[PDB]
Amino acid sequence: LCSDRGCENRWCK
Amino acid sequence: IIGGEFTTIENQPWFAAIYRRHRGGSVTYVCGGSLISPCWVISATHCFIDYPKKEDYIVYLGRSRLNSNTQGEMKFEVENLILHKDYSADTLAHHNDIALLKIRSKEGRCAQPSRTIQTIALPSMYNDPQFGTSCEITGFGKEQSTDYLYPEQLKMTVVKLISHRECQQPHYYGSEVTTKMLCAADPQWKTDSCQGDSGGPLVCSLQGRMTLTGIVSWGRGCALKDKPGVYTRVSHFLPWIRSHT
Numbered sequence A: 001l002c003s004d005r006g007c008e009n010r011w012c013k
Numbered sequence B: 001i002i003g004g005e006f007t008t009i010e011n012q013p014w015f016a017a018i019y020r021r022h023r024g025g026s027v028t029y030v031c032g033g034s035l036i037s038p039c040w041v042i043s044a045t046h047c048f049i050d051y052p053k054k055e056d057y058i059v060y061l062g063r064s065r066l067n068s069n070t071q072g073e074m075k076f077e078v079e080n081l082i083l084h085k086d087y088s089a090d091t092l093a094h095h096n097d098i099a100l101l102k103i104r105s106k107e108g109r110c111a112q113p114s115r116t117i118q119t120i121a122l123p124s125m126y127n128d129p130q131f132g133t134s135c136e137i138t139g140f141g142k143e144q145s146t147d148y149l150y151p152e153q154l155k156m157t158v159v160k161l162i163s164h165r166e167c168q169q170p171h172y173y174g175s176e177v178t179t180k181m182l183c184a185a186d187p188q189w190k191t192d193s194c195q196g197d198s199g200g201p202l203v204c205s206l207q208g209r210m211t212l213t214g215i216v217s218w219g220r221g222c223a224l225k226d227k228p229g230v231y232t233r234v235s236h237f238l239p240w241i242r243s244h245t
């Protein structure tokens, strides 16, 4: 459960 | 921006479009921001927290379209990237979600004012419009939650400010919303900011002055019933802003 606003330009495995 | 309408940069002349340059040379859109003085753009820390390297970023002023040049647009590097030291994210809530980008062109210049490039006023301390007041939001973010691409044309919409009373109701956000945040929504839940709008401006007319009241921060989904957009409350960060400027 993540905020879509929050998901910009983020790192992921 | 979910719903709303297309706009043009003369209508939002403080709007800053922030991109990131990748090795290989590809450039992608990151987040919105707002020009608060010739050398300073204000945005949100979460847009940069995983890639806090100022060299990576490109900031455009005077630009209406995502992947095209707008006549009179100015391109900038980031001289100083300043993230809020107390930034933190919970399950949904983002705290101290605020960032400053000192901008400069390759020639060393700050923004030159024009019809398409203007600063926006900061509010005075703890001085926000009354809840129920209409304010505008602006960005290149998703038009629908199901989209995986951003629109080419800048968008805006109008949302109403929601009281802390209402936004802390259990079917809204409970105590995850704090007094350093502002909630704003469409009464019929049809229009809202969304992914890619983060860091851009929530602008309210205060005394016939356009004022940067909020910075797009977080929310549950986009335009979901009982789930307002949540905004960094700029009027509670003036000491932080003034110090680093």
Ligand SMILES: *CCC(=O)N1CN(C(=O)CC*)CN(C(=O)CC*)C1
Pocket (backbone or CB within 6 Å): A001, A002, A003, A004, A006, A007, A010, A011, A012, A013, B091
């Ligand atoms: C739930 C929020 C979160 O943990 N992150 C933000 N983000 C997203 O992909 C949300 C859309 C990047 N994060 C990852 O863990 C990606 C693997 C962290």
